[PDB]
Scaffold this active site. Structure first.
Site, PDB file in Angstrom:
ATOM      1  N   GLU A   7       0.810  -1.228   0.000  1.00 23.66           N
ATOM      2  CA  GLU A   7       0.000   0.000   0.000  1.00 23.66           C
ATOM      3  C   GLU A   7       0.841   1.274   0.000  1.00 23.66           C
ATOM      4  O   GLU A   7       0.626   2.150  -0.826  1.00 23.66           O
ATOM      5  CB  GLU A   7      -0.931   0.034   1.202  1.00 23.66           C
ATOM      6  CG  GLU A   7      -2.130  -0.874   1.102  1.00 23.66           C
ATOM      7  CD  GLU A   7      -3.158  -0.360   0.140  1.00 23.66           C
ATOM      8  OE1 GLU A   7      -3.007   0.772  -0.340  1.00 23.66           O
ATOM      9  OE2 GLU A   7      -4.125  -1.079  -0.141  1.00 23.66           O
ATOM     10  N   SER A   8       1.801   1.366   0.919  1.00 31.12           N
ATOM     11  CA  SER A   8       2.548   2.603   1.136  1.00 31.12           C
ATOM     12  C   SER A   8       4.061   2.432   1.173  1.00 31.12           C
ATOM     13  O   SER A   8       4.793   3.391   1.418  1.00 31.12           O
ATOM     14  CB  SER A   8       2.118   3.250   2.448  1.00 31.12           C
ATOM     15  OG  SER A   8       2.469   2.414   3.523  1.00 31.12           O
TER      16      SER A   8
END
Ligand SMILES: [Cl-]
Lengths: 6, 419
Positions: free
Chosen positions: B276-277
């Site tokens: 995701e990040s």
């Protein structure tokens, strides 16, 4: 017509 | 009572479609902002093909207007009216890297070409076929632009003809596609209304688009959708292990505590956070997700997350979301497949994911097997297939990438722990 496109 | 603006459009990545958060798309958002201006409720209606879109638009009665990234045509023929233009595009011939770049329109001859039936581009070729009589091209209703691009990339057709913008949005998902050349002048896209004795609706449409161009609303829209993004690519073990050392140590304990709290493997949670990040608590998208687990403001709210930028809150919020998504799956789906399905829903939304399960069933496969459903997921990006589904288009191949990516990170983390 005419008209892909947003 | 009316109080509803009926807007006909295409179900397509550029105009309108459903994502994990509900309706979205350049066309959709622009049309809702308009509906909000008029103080009415927006009703989207989708058309099977462009011929149907125009058939719908001009029969009483009969949608108020068509927002579909259409090009004006003849003006003259007041039978269809067009708005002021909101987006400047250019039609480009599209070929495939590997095969030879056509340079002059004439080069198009003896190549397999496909365009949307009833389109401006079919008409460009129809014109061209007079200059070069032995030009041949195909045109279909069972095909959107995202299909054309797919077909060229995989090699099922040789050329196509699409608006420049449609590239600006899909090119990244089609590593083999290339612009051969611009084919036409730059033109503006416009909304279409029916003709026409009352200019009330039109005067207000154009009032909107004029001001919306000076508020910068069009450029914002242009950036929020024609800024390529979506699912991050797999980084390799070199980069990943560097982040095991540099980034994970700051968050490992948050991941562990959430795992404890929710009775799930904390390394699956961490894999999600990585895909995701890249384990960056300040990460953002102009798509509206933020934080280590890239949560929407709406989803953040619903998981107790008062600050999307607090990695501890983000990690609890997203982990909670993932595990709830997994508890809501049909009891039919057992582990470990259950978790893979849960990752798929985390990304693509449950509704699409259910589309794929049904498509899988009808296809004689097992809807409770991730191996089977994951073969159906990519078809959600094919008009012929998604049109026969409840929620329509979805870039399902990216959901597959998403899941498989998290699973690789999951394996490496499992290997590197596990004494
Ligand atoms: Cl598992």
């Amino acid at each position: 017509x005419a008209x892909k496109x947003x | 009572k009316e109080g509803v603006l009926r807007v006909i459009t295409r179900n397509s990545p550029a105009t309108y479609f459903q994502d994990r958060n509900g309706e979205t798309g350049f066309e959709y958002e622009l049309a809702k902002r308009f509906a909000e201006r008029l103080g009415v409720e927006l009703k989207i209606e989708t058309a099977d093909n462009l011929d149907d879109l125009y058939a719908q638009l001009s029969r009483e009665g009969g949608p108020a207007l068509a927002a579909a990234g259409l090009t004006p045509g003849r003006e003259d023929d007041a039978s269809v009216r067009y708005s002021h233009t909101y987006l400047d595009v250019t039609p480009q011939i599209i070929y495939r890297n590997g095969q030879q770049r056509p340079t002059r329109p004439e080069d198009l001859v003896g190549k397999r070409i496909m365009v949307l039936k009833g389109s401006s581009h079919a008409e460009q070729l129809a014109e061209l076929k007079k200059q070069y009589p032995e030009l041949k091209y195909e045109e279909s209703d069972a095909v959107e632009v995202v299909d054309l691009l797919r077909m060229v990339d995989v090699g099922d057709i040789d050329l196509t003809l699409v608006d420049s913008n449609e590239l600006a949005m899909n090119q990244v998902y089609f590593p083999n596609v290339r612009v051969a050349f611009d084919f036409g002048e730059a033109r503006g896209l416009a909304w279409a209304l029916p003709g026409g004795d009352d200019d009330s609706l039109m005067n207000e449409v154009n009032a909107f688009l004029d001001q919306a161009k000076k508020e910068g609303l069009l450029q914002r829209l242009k950036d929020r959708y024609y800024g390529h993004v979506d699912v991050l690519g797999y980084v390799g073990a070199y980069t990943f292990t560097q982040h095991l050392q540099q980034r994970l140590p700051r968050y490992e304990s948050h991941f562990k505590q959430s795992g404890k709290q929710k009775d799930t493997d904390w390394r699956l949670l961490a894999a999600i956070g990585y895909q995701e990040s890249l384990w960056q608590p300040g990460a953002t998208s102009k798509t509206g997700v933020r934080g280590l687990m890239m949560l929407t403001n709406r989803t953040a709210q619903a998981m107790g997350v008062s600050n999307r930028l607090d990695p501890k809150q983000s990690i609890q919020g997203g982990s909670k979301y993932f595990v709830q998504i997994r508890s809501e799956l049909p009891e039919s789906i057992k582990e470990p497949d259950r978790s893979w399905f849960a990752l798929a829903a985390y990304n693509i939304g449950g509704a699409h994911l259910e589309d794929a399960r049904k498509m899988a069933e009808k296809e004689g496969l097992n809807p409770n097997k991730w191996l089977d459903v994951k073969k159906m997921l990519p078809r959600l990006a094919q008009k012929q297939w998604y049109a026969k589904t409840r929620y329509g288009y979805a870039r399902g191949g990216e959901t597959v990438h998403f899941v498989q990516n998290v699973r690789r990170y999951y394996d490496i983390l499992t290997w590197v722990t596990q004494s």
